[PDB]
Ligand binder design. Structure first.
Ligand SMILES: NC1=N[C@@]23[C@@H](N1)[C@H](COC(=O)NCCCCCCNC(=O)c1ccc(C(=O)O)c(-c4c5ccc(=O)cc-5oc5cc(O)ccc45)c1)N=C(N)N2CCC3(O)O
Length: 819
């Protein structure tokens, strides 16, 4: 296997060459491919001349466009503020679940708030080992009849790990970190041989401008500093006296035309303060900046005066390359240090370490402040930088494997004698893989993505009076174009292939609303969308639809229930183990998902196949225990099929299986009524009595089938129309108005019917929808708010950590954004 790294300069190629020598990763060989600039390397990677390069966040965005089609895959993890520990989060979440769901696992945290390596399930006596994230080491379960397992100790904190590694198994003359009680870095660190001291934040990163030689007083070190985002700054010499607002006509050094810290952040501020007579005139920004400064060095620029101060020899002058000595963060600082500029635009990680000196920060509030005050004297937080590769991802694994092994082996990735910031930022300490579905939008975050886009094109913002509806198939798209035609512009349409892609479009500002099945709301809520209105399906009460706002007696959603015959008097909820169960089919929420979640919650995620003695659940393996109850009609049937061929499939089918050969069936609450009291003509349901069956309650009691509102496994939440938080008010308003025209009682229901169609069934909305009711948002967790406490608990253990879609790690990726 091979990894071809693209380098942008002779210095960088030389460093990459050294690594080919000095870093030995078995199975994977590194090679280095030279190109003359960032852009030429991007094109090389798109063309397969190379596989990977490290890019500033500004180039990550540029690379993500169709010209190059690169994506970020690896970056240094960062942190915005201090968070609760996972174990304590988990404890709180699971203690806030539905107390009616008894015997749930509550994690055991230690005096530091971590997971005890041994975790146990009180109500079952089962114990197992966990990793630091509290996830079960599979294959370590021990039963109550045995002693708790012996589990390896948890991995040490970064500080105690660095401490132990520096000691190298028994210390002298080198830096050994000093740690506190909780195992985090002490704010003040000192070198035990040189007498130097400096500040670090809570994960051990050095605070620039704090390095203090012995015999000097140290700057104060902030404790509990968990803000590890990088900050764009403007650095100046203390021998000049101008303020930020007087920058017009000075000489400037920038890390580069396409760098966030060297271009986007300053230019953004220039524009907000109106120092730059430029608006949206798409007069380019570079041209406007060209009028602002007298002479600058801005690698990658074309205007002549914005290259006048660079000093690269011949063609290399003003190149986005280390061969231009003033390129990059350290190059811009060199350019100021050598007095070719009066101000340099770079980021805090490139500031001098030493407290004392001729340099300080130029704050946009027209004051100046010391180097170590960048957190309150800056031009904004900037996104992380990343290793990128082709969108296709053919080499992602090889690239990750190589960098994981090189870092384990401590190869010299993050410095070099040949110069600073070669291959990677010198300030980098660790590179981790990004979520697999991450793209530039989710990596940079919506605020920085739009801000970068806004510098290149006049981004017309879609109207707040128009709802762009997202459709998942052509019939829906056709019904939505009919809606647009009569809506008078209130409705437009977009096309996607599935509901999850609709969620993505709404997040990215390409659509405004979509209707989601329950099975997709967890993912949509985790990504930050909100219910706007919901489908009210109750045919027995139209009052909430006639008078909007009135109080709803029964939303009318289905209620999953445990159905048993009145004959079986021994079968309660707690003894369902090993019994005969009938399931409508695998994947059905009331017949499988809800029961699956409760059995899992209360029995250590033991397979539902193994839990029941024998069942019928169409869609399982024909040879399985869940299929032997199934009969299959005309015998070829095809037992355990997701068709009416199987006589136990569906709401009615599971009901048959119960009366025939089963102790319990899991079905919606409506199946019994619609199939007893002679409601089904078929023979087996020959006048079966509704008083012949009862439903199981979770407390071990029972109740007549009629009390399903108080004796159910869980009620389903209604389907919901979701949108962006800031668009909820608009969408509600537009939809309610449309409903007054084209709802079941709309004033123009002859023009168009929202809740039906000749083009197909359940297009956009469910055809059985009575109306859409505004979501009354309660002050509580949206998960609990939208799902209801019973469902949240039974299906998701009332946890914000389930990952039912791999989009979730990408859409919850945290950003380095401003306000
Ligand atoms: N924000 C928001 N949310 C709503 C709402 N607006 C709209 C519309 O929704 C509606 O239906 N409104 C119209 C009213 C029609 C009746 C519905 C009222 N049903 C309950 O309030 C309820 C739900 C779940 C459970 C549960 O089992 O946990 C219990 C319940 C208990 C909880 C803890 C406990 O120890 C004991 C409990 O004991 C019970 C005992 C019983 O005997 C019978 C029921 C319970 C009670 N849409 C949503 N998606 N929503 C989500 C949740 C929500 O309904 O609030």
């Amino acid at each position: 296997r091979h990894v071809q790294w693209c380098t942008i300069s002779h210095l960088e190629q030389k460093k990459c060459n050294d690594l080919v020598g000095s870093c030995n990763v078995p199975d994977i060989t590194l090679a280095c491919v030279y190109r003359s600039s960032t852009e030429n390397c991007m094109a090389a990677i798109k063309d397969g001349q190379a596989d990977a390069m490290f890019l500033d966040s500004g180039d990550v965005y540029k690379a993500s466009l169709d010209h190059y089609n690169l994506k970020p895959i690896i970056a240094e993890p960062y942190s915005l503020h201090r968070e609760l520990t996972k174990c304590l989060k988990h404890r709180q979440e699971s203690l806030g679940g539905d107390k009616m769901v008894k015997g749930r696992y509550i994690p055991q945290c230690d005096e530091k708030g971590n997971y005890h390596p041994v975790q146990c399930h009180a109500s079952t006596g089962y114990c197992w080992c966990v990793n630091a994230n509290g996830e079960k080491i599979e294959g370590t379960n021990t039963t109550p009849v045995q002693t708790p397992p012996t589990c390896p100790s948890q991995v040490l904190t970064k500080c105690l790990k660095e401490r132990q590694e520096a000691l190298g198994g028994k210390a002298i003359g080198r830096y050994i970190p000093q740690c506190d009680e909780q195992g985090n870095y002490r704010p003040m660190q000192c070198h035990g041989s040189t007498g130097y001291c400096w500040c670090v934040n809570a994960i051990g990163e050095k605070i620039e401008g704090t390095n203090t030689p012995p015999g000097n007083t140290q700057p104060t070190c902030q404790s509990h500093d968990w803000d590890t985002c990088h900050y764009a700054v403007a650095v100046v010499k203390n021998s000049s006296t101008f303020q930020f607002g007087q920058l017009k006509g000075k000489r400037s050094c920038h890390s580069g035309l396409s760098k966030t810290d060297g271009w986007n952040a300053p230019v953004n501020v220039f524009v907000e303060k109106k120092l730059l007579p430029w608006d949206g005139l798409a007069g380019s920004i570079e041209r406007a900046v060209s009028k602002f400064f007298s002479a600058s060095c801005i690698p990658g620029a074309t205007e002549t005066n914005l290259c006048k101060q660079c000093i690269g020899e011949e063609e290399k002058k003003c190149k986005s390359s280390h061969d231009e000595p003033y390129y990059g963060d350290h190059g811009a600082f060199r350019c100021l240090q050598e007095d070719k500029g009066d101000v340099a635009f770079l980021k805090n990680t490139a500031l001098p370490d030493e407290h004392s000196g001729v340099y300080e920060l130029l704050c946009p509030d027209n004051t100046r402040k010391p180097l170590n005050k960048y957190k309150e004297c800056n031009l904004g937080k900037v996104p992380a930088d990343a290793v990128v590769t082709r969108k296709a991802g053919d080499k992602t694994k090889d690239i990750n494997d190589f960098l994981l092994e090189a870092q384990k082996k401590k190869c010299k990735l993050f410095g070099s004698p040949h110069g600073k910031d070669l291959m990677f930022d010198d300030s980098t300490t660790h590179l981790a893989p990004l979520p697999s579905e991450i793209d530039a939008f989710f990596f940079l975050g919506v605020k920085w993505y739009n801000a970068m886009k806004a510098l290149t094109e006049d981004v017309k913002l879609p109207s707040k009076n128009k709802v762009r509806w997202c459709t998942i198939n052509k019939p829906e798209m056709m019904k939505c174009k009919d809606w647009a035609a009569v809506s008078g512009g209130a409705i437009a349409c977009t096309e996607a292939s599935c509901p999850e892609h609709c969620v993505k479009q709404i997040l990215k500002g390409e659509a405004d609303a979509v209707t989601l099945d329950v099975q997709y709301m967890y993912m949509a809520l985790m990504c930050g969308l909100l219910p706007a209105v919901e489908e009210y399906p109750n045919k027995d009460d139209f009052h909430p639809c006639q008078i909007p706002g009135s109080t709803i007696k029964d939303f009318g959603t289905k209620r999953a229930v445990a159905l048993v015959k009145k004959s079986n008097k021994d079968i309660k909820w707690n003894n369902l183990k090993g019994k005969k169960s009938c399931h409508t089919h695998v994947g059905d929420i009331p017949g499988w998902v809800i029961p699956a979640g409760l059995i899992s919650n209360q029995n250590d995620n033991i397979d539902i196949e193994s839990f029941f003695g024998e069942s019928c659940a169409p869609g399982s393996d024909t040879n399985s225990k869940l299929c032997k109850l199934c009969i299959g009609p005309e015998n070829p049937s095809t037992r355990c099929s997701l068709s009416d061929k199987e006589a136990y499939y569906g709401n009615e089918g599971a009901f048959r299986c119960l009366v025939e050969k089963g102790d319990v069936a899991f079905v919606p609450h409506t199946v019994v009524f619609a199939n007893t009291d002679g409601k089904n003509p078929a023979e087996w349901a020959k006048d079966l009595k509704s008083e012949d069956f009862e439903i199981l309650c979770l407390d071990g009691s029972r109740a007549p089938v009629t009390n399903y509102r108080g004796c159910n496994l869980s009620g389903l939440p209604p389907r919901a129309i979701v949108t962006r938080e800031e668009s909820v008010s608009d969408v509600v308003r537009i939809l309610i108005n449309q409903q007054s025209l084209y709802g079941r009682n709309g004033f123009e229901k002859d023009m168009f019917q929202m809740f039906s169609s000749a083009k197909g069934q359940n297009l956009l909305f469910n055809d059985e929808t009575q109306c859409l009711i505004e979501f009354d948002r309660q002050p509580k967790d949206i998960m609990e708010d939208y799902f209801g406490v019973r469902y949240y608990t039974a299906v998701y253990s009332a946890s914000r950590s389930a990952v039912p879609s791999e989009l979730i790690p990408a859409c919850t990726f945290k950003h380095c954004s401003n306000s």
